[PDB]
Ligand binder design. Structure first.
Ligand SMILES: Nc1nc2c(ncn2CCN(CCN(CC=O)CCP(=O)(O)O)CCP(=O)(O)O)c(=O)[nH]1
Ligand SMILES: Nc1nc2c(ncn2CCN(CCN(CC=O)CCP(=O)(O)O)CCP(=O)(O)O)c(=O)[nH]1
Ligand SMILES: Nc1nc2c(ncn2CCN(CCN(CC=O)CCP(=O)(O)O)CCP(=O)(O)O)c(=O)[nH]1
Ligand SMILES: Nc1nc2c(ncn2CCN(CCN(CC=O)CCP(=O)(O)O)CCP(=O)(O)O)c(=O)[nH]1
Ligand SMILES: [Mg+2]
Ligand SMILES: [Mg+2]
Ligand SMILES: [Mg+2]
Ligand SMILES: [Mg+2]
Ligand SMILES: [Mg+2]
Ligand SMILES: [Mg+2]
Ligand SMILES: [Mg+2]
Ligand SMILES: [Mg+2]
Lengths: 175, 181, 174, 176
């Protein structure tokens, strides 16, 4: 039975497909960061709110010790900063989607100014307009078309985040 | 294994946690079955960072009614300073039906402060769902509608629970080797 | 420059005034239409000496007429009693800190036996034992940990009451 | 936005006028007691006369840069209603009043407290009326005001208007 009956037009990524890719990502990320030298765990900086489901599944798929951080930014200003000093830490930005790349471009500049040991980016979704941006993304879950999607953290007006899958919305929803 | 030697024993396995959460989700779903149809708004989950993050993402997926995510963080009783909001809610909860989602209730001091703070914002309803509950919570004064597990007083880590920010990423909940703590 | 026995600042002057403004406006909304009905002003009962700074700033933040009364109790007996009868009056007990809840419990019992129309409590600070004991308090400025604090009416052996801020006393003296 | 709509006819002293003057008094009192208090190692005792001087003393004490302590007294209209909980022998004591008018309250209280033999006694009043500019030396005077009856900032009419942040005169209809 549909959680939001009639609201989802079509499925883009099943729950099974999402988890399988996250398993792959975690192993790849674990490979690249395999704390024995530095003595400090990989730092996952989650961009609230869309990336919260992604990061909890991803962290459990990463076979090395990881720590959680949470940020929230607007459409350039910080609503919610780090409770952490990332100086000398290995940092991984965890996003749900990169579209224009504006959020990432801003977040990359902010975090790198705090002088971390390293900074990399992991996003679940990447849309075609990200081509025009210039911040390297080491880890990408899926490349998708330009359409507006919801589910698995992705919202429309704070709704549909709780979906286990990702899909597009019926036009009637925006009304 | 993630932390070789650090974990002494496993209190709750990954499957046991997920199985219980599925039970909780269904129970909560039944209690709020008509919420979206009656009020026109979804059940609001207020997650207390950072310990409850893993819990709430699994819980929300286990709840068969529409749920909305909000997150907040409060300071510690420990000189930790006055009890205060470190990270505030994004949306207004006025007239909303709210479920406080916690990882563990122990002394009940955090929940008491949270309950008073959120109540003053006048939600339609306010209830509590915690994954773990310790024996000292019996002296606490805030009603808890949903509890995953009652556990002993021993210090545990995993599935959101930390020791100095470590061990949150474990899929299970376990006790720590005294060499650490 | 801070006095030597001040370890750290728990609450700055600005933080205190900011919260008092919130409490003042809240108290005003709670008693505005009520006071207009009875024709009598809201009565503030100050517990000397700790709550004296708190009550003068609070009263000036409360947008409805308020009257002052002062009481002083021991650590059992009444050192200073009320100057007027509070029968049928709306009374707000004003304290600096509620800890064990012992003082508030005794005062409430003593004041309710004078039959005021309403008897409510406003404290600037509250320590965890008051939370455990589930002490009913209508207005609370701040929840604080068990650490001994001075300033803004709060004292250590009658000292430091005149500080504009609330600071954590250096554990090297208490 | 008036606390007492129509009751206040005029404003004699604004809130910022009172606070500006208190800041000056606190700085003056501080300079006069700085080296003086360090010799004894004991704080200056502020003896407050209830209830009118309560607003004043809380702002004044915060304006005084040297350490101070609070005491409170209540007298009739002369006997003691609330007495000192404390012996002030050898202490430096500053009487804090809201207004000195006839001077009879201050005169009686000054001799009563000197009979407890403090190391030094001084008087500080926020307001002084013309017949008080004349028994007791007042080292610190906030304002010299006319004889007119005023309320606010601790000053009451029938226990009302104490909570006003300013000092002003009442409309004659209030006396009905
Ligand atoms: N739900 C959804 N959101 C979409 C989509 N495309 C872009 N976005 C906007 C995602 N974000 C919105 C940023 N926004 C505030 C910044 O953190 C997200 C807050 P949220 O995760 O709580 O929804 C823009 C990425 P970019 O354009 O800067 O690269 C989409 O298909 N679905
Ligand atoms: N990791 C861990 N933490 C434990 C445990 N028992 C109590 N706690 C303290 C959990 N909490 C700590 C509160 N603390 C700040 C409040 O949000 C948690 C922040 P965190 O979730 O980021 O770790 C106390 C609950 P209470 O005593 O007020 O009812 C335990 O066995 N393991
Ligand atoms: N200065 C200071 N005092 C503290 C503190 N914690 C408890 N107390 C003692 C508070 N006591 C004060 C009682 N005692 C006589 C009653 O008015 C204080 C007189 P005072 O205000 O003139 O200093 C009551 C708290 P409770 O346990 O009865 O609820 C603290 O951190 N600082
Ligand atoms: N509210 C008000 N009161 C005024 C005024 N002028 C003299 N007073 C009388 C002030 N006091 C009244 C004394 N009275 C009892 C003694 O403490 C004041 C009690 P209170 O502060 O609670 O109102 C007389 C000073 P004096 O004539 O002996 O030098 C005035 O303009 N407004
Ligand atoms: Mg995002
Ligand atoms: Mg969004
Ligand atoms: Mg918690
Ligand atoms: Mg913790
Ligand atoms: Mg007190
Ligand atoms: Mg005391
Ligand atoms: Mg007087
Ligand atoms: Mg009078």
């Amino acid at each position: 039975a549909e959680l939001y009956p009639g609201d989802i037009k079509s499925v883009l990524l099943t729950a099974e497909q999402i988890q399988a890719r996250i398993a792959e990502l975690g192993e790849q990320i674990g490979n690249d960061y395999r704390s024995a030298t530095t003595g400090q765990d990989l730092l996952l900086i989650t961009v609230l709110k869309g990336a919260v489901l992604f990061v909890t599944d991803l962290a459990r798929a990463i076979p090395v010790p990881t720590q959680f951080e949470f940020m929230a930014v607007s459409s350039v200003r910080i609503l919610k900063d780090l409770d952490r000093d990332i100086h000398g830490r290995d940092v991984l930005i965890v996003e749900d989607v990169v579209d224009s790349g504006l959020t990432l471009s801003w977040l990359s500049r902010n975090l790198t100014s705090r002088n971390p040991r390293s900074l990399r980016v992991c996003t679940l979704l990447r849309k075609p307009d990200a081509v025009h941006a210039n911040v390297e993304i080491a880890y990408v879950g899926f490349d998708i078309p330009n359409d507006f999607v919801v589910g698995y953290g992705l919202d429309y007006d704070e709704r549909y985040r709780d979906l286990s899958y990702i899909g597009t919305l019926d036009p009637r929803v925006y009304q």
